[PDB]
Design a protein around this nucleic acid. Sequence first.
DNA 1: GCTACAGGACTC
DNA 2: GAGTCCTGTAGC
Length: 579
Amino acid sequence: KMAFTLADRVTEEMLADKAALVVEVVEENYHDAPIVGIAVVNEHGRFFLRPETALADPQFVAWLGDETKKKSMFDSKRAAVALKWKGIELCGVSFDLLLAAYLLDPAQGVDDVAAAAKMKQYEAVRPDEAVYGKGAKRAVPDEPVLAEHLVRKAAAIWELERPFLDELRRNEQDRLLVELEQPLSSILAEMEFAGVKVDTKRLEQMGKELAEQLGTVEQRIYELAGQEFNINSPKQLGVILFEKLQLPVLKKTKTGYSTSADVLEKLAPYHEIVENILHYRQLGKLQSTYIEGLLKVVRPDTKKVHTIFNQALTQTGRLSSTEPNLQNIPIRLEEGRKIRQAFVPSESDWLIFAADYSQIELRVLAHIAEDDNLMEAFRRDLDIHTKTAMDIFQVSEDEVTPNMRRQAKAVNFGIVYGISDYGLAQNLNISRKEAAEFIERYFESFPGVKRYMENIVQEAKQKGYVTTLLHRRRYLPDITSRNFNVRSFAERMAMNTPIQGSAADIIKKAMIDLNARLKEERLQAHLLLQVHDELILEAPKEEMERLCRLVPEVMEQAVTLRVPLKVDYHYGSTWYDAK
DNA sequence: GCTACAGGACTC
DNA sequence: GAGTCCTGTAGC
């Protein structure tokens, strides 16, 4: 039904200087993945090219990489990485539907061109699912469908650039798309593509230290329970824990009896089997998610891992790491921290470098909230948990017990999460009444934070959305809901979001600045991962000395606040040593 | 047999 | 508060 030329060769009018492009990749994981077809739509018409003919053509490939040749796209990073794997540069991408959709309403859950399209009531396109099918009946149809399917995506992108930008403007979010997300989209593609090398040996050996330890703990657990059973079944376990051995049921979940770690620790005194099992959850998590996790996704050719960072998914501005998730590798506990030693540099005589912000959320809070005693603390560069423990309890610095500090930590963390008086009482472990005297002690210690927490919920009511520093919206319909629980979750979001979100903003700018700076300074150093509040680079050892001074600087001047930002650095042989 | 949810646990 | 990914299980 939709008009187009199914082309046999590339012509001089498919190489206009404004054009919607589709480099369709179909597999969810785009690294080293087939490109199934190309669609171009411009001032002249609508064209489909087979990849093998278009990607062999030196004016097309020259057009792909020419930055004065503007392209609109949907999920251009998807596209760029595919083309990167084929040794082809893509540039001059000046509009990205996905990102613009994602900035106008992260809640919309946009994952294809069609959903991007509804937002403007454009229904002249099909959902990818409906052309390709779900999960494991997923195939690429014969060429007639396929070809029509893409020309409709390009045509839409062509047709919708204008309303989105039109709108983005109205929300002051244009600079945030052009100056932030899209440039960042380039950086990330570079990163994903770069890879992160793994010591597969180090990994198969841990891999096998764990299988010894597990089979030991696996027998013992049996020995103790008088029974073999599926220790990984949250069902058979609760038969063994609370049925055969009669243990107190402290907590329940809809299906049955709760077997979470937070519960197994209170049960610990009643029987040996508890702590041995606990140990097992721990080992199991390392073995199954991690040793096996990683050992499955390494390209056994280059021995690297190439995560995809999703840039259009979290509600707050945060990136997200998939296959493998490299934003959740173990750290708090030594047995698991040793995983970080399998991340190595990709070159002989290079090192891993790490830099993180220290208390980015709270500095951001001090800044938005404008609380003097929060700001002042940071201008003093204080130990903020001790400062709060000090303040919520009313005791001098040397007065502070370590149980008093881990409690003010919880209050701090709680406050950013806009936590409930009951909800902190569970977390901590005290009565709900005085758990609220804590909060009330906190808030008279920090008036200005109380005010922001008040005015933000109001400002979310009046307007329907909340806002970060860089103008990133989150819409909050469930703020007026008559359900108390649901209204309350919306409220927490009103408070926590401009914070988690303003941090996400700042770091993403630090990335643009650092990528520019590492270049401006002609350095071989490149970014490897971002993990919410830190950046990870790898560079030749010759370079560490300029980095220790360069990375922290850029990360710290990425924005101007009412308080200053602190970045700590760290470099070593491996991820693990960068500590 | 393939698929969707539920419970747990890992990071910031 | 914001994420991902694992095993088993409940059910087509």
